[PDB]
Amino acid sequence: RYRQLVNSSFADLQK
Amino acid sequence: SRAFAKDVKRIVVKVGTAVVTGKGGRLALGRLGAICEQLAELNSDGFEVILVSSGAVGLGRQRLRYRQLVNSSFADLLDGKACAGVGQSSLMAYYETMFDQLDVTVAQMLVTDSSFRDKDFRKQLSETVKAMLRMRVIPVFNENDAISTRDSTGIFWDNDSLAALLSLELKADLLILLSDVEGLYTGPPSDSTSKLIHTFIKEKHQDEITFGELGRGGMTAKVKAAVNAAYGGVPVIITSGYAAENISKVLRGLRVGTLFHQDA
Amino acid sequence: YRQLVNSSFADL
Amino acid sequence: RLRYRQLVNSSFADLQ
Numbered sequence: 344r345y346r347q348l349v350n351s352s353f354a355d356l357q358k
Numbered sequence: 359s360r361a362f363a364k365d366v367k368r369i370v371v372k373v374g375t376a377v378v379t380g381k382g383g384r385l386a387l388g389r390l391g392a393i394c395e396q397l398a399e400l401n402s403d404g405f406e407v408i409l410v411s412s413g414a415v416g417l418g419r420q421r422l423r424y425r426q427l428v429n430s431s432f433a434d435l436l437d438g439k440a441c442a443g444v445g446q447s448s449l450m451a452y453y454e455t456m457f458d459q460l461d462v463t464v465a466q467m468l469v470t471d472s473s474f475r476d477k478d479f480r481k482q483l484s485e486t487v488k489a490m491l492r493m494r495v496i497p498v499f500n501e502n503d504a505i506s507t508r509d510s511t512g513i514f515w516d517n518d519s520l521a522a523l524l525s526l527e528l529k530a531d532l533l534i535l536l537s538d539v540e541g542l543y544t545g546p547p548s549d550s551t552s553k554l555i556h557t558f559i560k561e562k563h564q565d566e567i568t569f570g571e572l573g574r575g576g577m578t579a580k581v582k583a584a585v586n587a588a589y590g591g592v593p594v595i596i597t598s599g600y601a602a603e604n605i606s607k608v609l610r611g612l613r614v615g616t617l618f619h620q621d622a
Numbered sequence: 623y624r625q626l627v628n629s630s631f632a633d634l
Numbered sequence: 635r636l637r638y639r640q641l642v643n644s645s646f647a648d649l650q
């Protein structure tokens with residue numbers, strides 16, 4: 344979790 | 359047969375969220391384009407078309423999504439009334455921008471549930487639509503989900519029942535509804551026990567066909583709207599929107615889709 | 623970092 | 635413009 348977002352491109356978070 | 363097809367003057371076409379919106383809640387620029395292209399071409403032939411749109415919910419939702427995400431913090435670890443506002447803005451934008459490519463002018467006329475109970479509002483709308491659809495102007499109707507609070511008229515008053523009633527009110531014919539399936543299958547399309555029907559007999563079919571299992575609209579409302587419009591005196595044809603050239607074949611004297619007429 | 627943790631893509 | 639385009643595809647770990 345934390346790590347996932349820690350290393351993600353915001354555009355991705357939109358996924 | 360399809361003898362009524364050759365002699366229609368005022369045609370109404372309705373597009374649901376199943377066709378206007380594609381994957382990722384993004385306007386299906388493809389289908390939405392091809393169909394509006396063909397509609398502009400058809401209007402350039404002198405016909406009088408009526409457009410009903412249903413994609414406010416989805417586009418709205420996506421846009422709000424983005425706007426929220428743009429302003430969020432670690433939250434990465436919506437009310438329709440707004441979704442619809444933004445969705446309508448966007449849909450109307452696309453329709454216009456796309457229709458300005460063929461010098462076809464469209465005016466957005468929006469109706470609400472608490473408006474069709476008035477005795478003279480129907481007459482006023484009839485006169486204004488008749489006046490507007492004379493200089494090759496295409497009007498666009500859609501349920502105004504923003505102001506909407508909720509029997510009114512039309513069950514669940516989705517765009518299907520709205521289109522059926524509106525075509526029943528204004529003297530017109532050939533109610534065309536665009537879905538993602540190539541007609542009214544007698545059953546679920548996935549199952550092999552499902553065959554397309556050329557026609558529709560009220561007493562033979564309605565009792566025994568069984569179906570059911572898309573924010574705007576919903577099946578089992580389409581059939582009721584079609585039957586209550588056809589028994590009112592307006593022919594109804596159902597055809598898929600995945601091939602926008604289908605409607606041109608409909609309006610030439612060729613048999614595709616399902617029928618709903620006063621005949622038996 | 624805690625700052626970045628607390629911001630908006632808009633913020634950046 | 636292009637800055638926005640990039641940020642969009644950037645990973646938090648790259649904004650440091």
Ligand SMILES: Nc1ncnc2c1ncn2[C@@H]1O[C@H](COP(=O)(O)OP(=O)(O)O)[C@@H](O)[C@H]1O
Binds near residue numbers: 374377539576577
């Ligand atoms: N009798 C049937 N024949 C074919 N398809 C059906 C039938 N009943 C339900 N469906 C499917 O159910 C779905 C419901 O969507 P529909 O209400 O038709 O469009 P929208 O949700 O845009 O109003 C349709 O996509 C359709 O394919």
